């Protein structure tokens, strides 16, 4: 048998917004859970009252999605993913 | 659905035209049913 | 599929941040010297 | 000692420099005899292209993080060295205080202007003698409320109280002496659209409660008994004028107001119903 070809297009997989936002939302969700648990351990360890507004933050998901879809990086791993739409003509 | 929360505190529906004119971000809010339990074990 | 809440937003957005409603759920709330001698 | 360069025209010498600055040619010229005053003009926009004194001051610092090709042992030794020199300056409280205040403001969904005003207020107070404690919670809550009052925003005491348990009384004293600090370093209408947003009411009911709020502020009688009850009874009347039904229990449990208070204000308000009609 010949050496396995890597240029075969069938062995290649493309990634649209689905997989990218799956990785991104996955990591951001993990960080969210870790931070919430950190607030839980701080609450039970320092012996105080609990609050739902200080445990679950929204700027981690908002800053993660807004920052990743705002800049070219998808977090340098990946760059040049997001580009400004070219409105020179319709075929462009 | 897509929405916008302004500076004074009012949140209304967003359209892509007004999103482009006001330099906003066309996004939608996300909620989660968070369940809590306490075991004593 | 994911269910889209159809309300007037302002109610849910009011329940997000400060809504003047706290508590409502219990979770992570936690001499005479001779006689003494 | 002097060090002030003043450009004058030796040929004109008839008036202080009333000159013109030619940026395209890079010169500055007297607008009278047309004689140039200086060549090779520097720019401020061009040096700014590559790149906070209001809060950080003139202090400089640089981070040490891991490198492309480095060892994890050296990264820890450099960070532990900075951990021993962190006591040389008492500015660790400003970064941690601004971090927790950042978390609370980000939790309250307030704009960045109120965040910067609150950080500026906490920087004005910081560690003075008249503060004398308050366990860092009351100066943060009171600083957020001050930054809210400065940015023309409206947040009730029960809202920040719902965020932070400051025991109200000590919060009021710390807010009072803090206001004295601000005075030593030298409006209910905004609440209506917020509660109308909490109830999801149309714009006509919002501006109707605006005119009702102003008129009720002009009629006197009761005067206020805190503006919150005036707001909730004003919205209660403006919503009993139309047909959208909420009753008194739902609006009393949503806005956290007593039913007997909105009915007590609805009585005299119904008595003054005459002069409150806009159209
Ligand atoms: Zn001298
Ligand atoms: Zn001249």
Swiss-Prot record, chain B:
What is annotated about its quaternary structure and interactions? Component of the RNA polymerase II (Pol II) complex consisting of 12 subunits.
Instruction: Give the family, as the similarity comment puts it.
Output: Belongs to the RNA polymerase beta chain family.
Q: Which residues form a coiled coil?
A: none
Q: This protein's superkingdom?
A: Eukaryota
Q: Where is it located?
A: Nucleus
Other comment = The binding of ribonucleoside triphosphate to the RNA polymerase II transcribing complex probably involves a two-step mechanism. The initial binding seems to occur at the entry (E) site and involves a magnesium ion coordinated by three conserved aspartate residues of the two largest RNA Pol II subunits.
The protein's job, in short, is: DNA-dependent RNA polymerase catalyzes the transcription of DNA into RNA using the four ribonucleoside triphosphates as substrates. Second largest component of RNA polymerases II which synthesizes mRNA precursors and many functional non-coding RNAs. Proposed to contribute to the polymerase catalytic activity and forms the polymerase active center together with the largest subunit. Pol II is the central component of the basal RNA polymerase II transcription machinery.
Q: What is this protein called?
A: DNA-directed RNA polymerase II subunit RPB2
From Swiss-Prot, chain C:
Q: Which residues cross the membrane?
A: none
| Domain of life assignment | Eukaryota
Q: Where in the cell is it found?
A: Nucleus
- Name the protein family: Belongs to the TFIIF beta subunit family.
Question: What job does this protein perform?
Answer: TFIIF is a general transcription initiation factor that binds to RNA polymerase II. Its functions include the recruitment of RNA polymerase II to the promoter bound DNA-TBP-TFIIB complex, decreasing the affinity of RNA polymerase II for non-specific DNA, allowing for the subsequent recruitment of TFIIE and TFIIH, and facilitating RNA polymerase II elongation.
The record makes one more remark, namely: Present with 520 molecules/cell in log phase SD medium.
Q: Kindly state the subunit structure of this protein.
A: TFIIF is composed of three different subunits: TFG1/RAP74, TFG2/RAP30 and TAF14.
The protein's name is Transcription initiation factor IIF subunit beta
Origin organism of this chain? Saccharomyces cerevisiae (strain ATCC 204508 / S288c) (Baker's yeast)
UniProtKB/Swiss-Prot annotation, chain D:
Family the UniProt entry places it in: Belongs to the TFIIB family.
InterPro entries listed in its UniProt record: Cyclin-like_dom (IPR013763), Cyclin-like_sf (IPR036915), TFIIB (IPR000812), TFIIB_CS (IPR023486), TFIIB_cyclin (IPR013150), Znf_TFIIB (IPR013137)
What is the annotated role of this protein in its UniProt record? General factor that plays a major role in the activation of eukaryotic genes transcribed by RNA polymerase II.
Molecular function GO labels? RNA polymerase II complex binding; RNA polymerase II complex recruiting activity; RNA polymerase II general transcription initiation factor activity; TBP-class protein binding; zinc ion binding
Give residue ranges of zinc fingers (TFIIB-type).
Answer: 5-38
Listed binding positions for Zn(2+) are 9, 12, 30, 33
Gene Ontology CC annotations of this record: nucleus; transcription preinitiation complex
State the oligomer form and interacting partners: Associates with TFIID-IIA (DA complex) to form TFIID-IIA-IIB (DAB-complex) which is then recognized by polymerase II.
**What biological-process GO terms show up in the record?**
DNA-templated transcription initiation; RNA polymerase II preinitiation complex assembly; transcription open complex formation at RNA polymerase II promoter; transcriptional start site selection at RNA polymerase II promoter
Q: Give the sequence repeat ranges.
A: 104-180, 195-271
State the protein's name.
Transcription initiation factor IIB
Q: Which UniProt keywords apply?
A: Metal-binding, Nucleus, Repeat, Transcription, Transcription regulation, Zinc, Zinc-finger
Q: Which organism is it from?
A: Saccharomyces cerevisiae (strain ATCC 204508 / S288c) (Baker's yeast)
Q: Which Gene3D superfamilies match?
A: 1.10.472.170, Cyclin-like (1.10.472.10)
Task: State where the protein is found.
Answer: Nucleus
**Further information:** Present with 6750 molecules/cell in log phase SD medium.
């Amino acid at each position: 048998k010949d050496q396995d070809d890597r240029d075969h297009f069938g062995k290649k997989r493309l990634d649209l917004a689905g997989p990218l936002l799956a990785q991104l939302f996955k990591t951001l969700f993990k960080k969210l859970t870790k931070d919430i648990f950190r607030y839980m351990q701080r609450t039970v360890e320092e012996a105080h009252d609990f609050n739902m507004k200080l445990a679950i933050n929204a700027k981690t998901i908002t800053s993660g999605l807004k920052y990743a879809l705002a800049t070219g990086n998808w977090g340098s791993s990946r760059a040049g993913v997001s580009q400004v739409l070219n409105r020179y003509t319709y075929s462009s | 659905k897509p929405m916008v929360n302004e500076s004074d505190g009012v949140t209304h529906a967003l359209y892509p035209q007004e999103a482009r004119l006001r330099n906003l971000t066309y996004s939608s809010g996300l909620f989660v049913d968070v369940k809590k339990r306490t075991y004593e074990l | 599929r994911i269910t889209t809440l159809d309300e007037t937003v302002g109610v849910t957005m009011s329940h997000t941040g400060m809504s003047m409603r706290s508590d409502n759920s219990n979770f992570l709330k936690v001499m005479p010297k001779k006689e003494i001698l | 000692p002097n060090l002030n360069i003043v450009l004058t025209c030796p040929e004109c010498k008839v008036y202080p420099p009333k000159i013109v600055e030619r940026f395209s040619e890079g010169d500055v010229v007297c607008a009278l005899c047309g004689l140039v005053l200086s060549d090779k003009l520097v720019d401020t926009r061009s040096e700014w292209r590559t790149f906070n004194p209001l809060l950080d001051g003139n202090n400089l610092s640089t981070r040490i993080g891991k490198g492309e090709t480095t060892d994890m042992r050296f990264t820890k030794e450099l960070n532990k060295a900075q951990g021993k020199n962190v006591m040389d300056k008492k500015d660790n409280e400003v970064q941690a205080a601004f971090a927790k205040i950042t978390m609370l403001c980000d939790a309250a969904e307030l704009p960045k202007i109120v965040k910067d005003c609150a950080k500026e207020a906490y920087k004005l107070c910081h560690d003075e003698k008249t503060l004398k404690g308050k366990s860092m919670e009351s100066i943060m809550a009171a600083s957020i409320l001050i930054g809210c009052r400065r940015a023309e925003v409206a947040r009730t005491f029960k809202e920040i109280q719902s965020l932070i348990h400051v025991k109200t009384k000590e919060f009021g004293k710390t807010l009072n002496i803090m206001k004295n600090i601000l005075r030593g370093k030298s409006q209910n209408l905004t609440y209506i659209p917020r509660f109308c947003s909490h109830l999801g009411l149309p714009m006509q009911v919002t501006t109707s409660a605006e005119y009702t709020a102003k008129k009720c502020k002009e009629i006197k009688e009761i005067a206020g008994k805190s503006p919150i009850t005036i707001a909730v009874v004003s919205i209660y009347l403006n919503i009993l004028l139309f047909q959208i039904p909420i009753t008194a229990a739902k609006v009393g449990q949503t806005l956290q107001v007593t039913e007997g208070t909105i009915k007590s204000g609805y009585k005299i308000l119904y008595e003054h119903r005459d002069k409150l009609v806009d159209p």
